[PDB]
Structure 1
């Protein structure tokens, strides 16, 4: 689970805070990555207000911050989906697309 302000890239609107997306049930199209690393687009098919949970702030090398729950999986450079806390503990590298749109 991700904090309110974490921004998601939408085709129609650009970057939106997931909190706003969820709490307004915003229908929008987002970008996903392939089994083989191809980028494509698809619609959001579900919306979850999870309520309150324990959140950590993970500061990245580039100044980016991710505020999430420990278990929240992110894509590694090797293409695996691993909980961000384990990525942090194991000093693993996050995949970063750079060429989304």
Structure 2
């Protein structure tokens, strides 16, 4: 089974993001998001709240510098497979994550010298994180 650190943020329908420590310690009734064997995202209630006691926690820092704090043996989704996170780390596999992400806020920075690149076909190019910039 394995376990997660207190502040690991869990998506709930009712409350939005909540720390799993709080969901478990307060045994909060909520609806979480799951994925089936055919890649369908659905929702269902939390059915068991597991307080696993004390265990060794490792902090896994991802390429974008975000953090997952878990025991070595907790499984995470990699393409078509659930694997222990430590193995995912040892094997350099990509964790599955949301294919999309929203813009939270916007700021003005005034004027700057700015740049663009032309390519022959399709007229786009990937940035860090895999964002696709385009001139079309």
CA deviation string 1:45-73 (max 9, x = no partner): 00011111000000011221000000000
In structure 1, the gaps of 5 or more residues are: 96-101
Q: Which structure is higher in RCO with an 8 Å CA cutoff and minimum separation 6?
A: 1
Task: Provide the rounded CA distance (Å) in 1 between the counterparts of 2:61 and 2:39.
Answer: 25
Task: Provide the rounded CA distance (Å) in 2 between the counterparts of 1:62 and 1:8.
Answer: 19
Task: Kindly state the Cα deviation for residue 34 of structure 1 after the two structures are TM-superposed.
Answer: 1.4
User: Matched residue of 2:76: which SS?
Assistant: strand
Aligned to 1:23: 25
Task: Provide the rounded CA distance (Å) in 2 between the counterparts of 1:13 and 1:78.
Answer: 28
* Aligned ranges 1:14-93 → 2 under 5 Å: 14-75=16-77, 77-93=78-94
Give the TM-score, by structure 2 length. Answer: 0.68
In structure 2, the gaps of 5 or more residues are: 97-136
Dislocated runs of 4+, deviation >2 Å: none
Task: Kindly state the Cα deviation for residue 15 of structure 1 after the two structures are TM-superposed.
Answer: 0.4
Task: Provide the rounded CA distance (Å) in 2 between the counterparts of 1:16 and 1:40.
Answer: 18
Task: Kindly state the Cα deviation for residue 3 of structure 1 after the two structures are TM-superposed.
Answer: 0.5
Task: Provide the rounded CA distance (Å) in 1 between the counterparts of 2:80 and 2:52.
Answer: 27
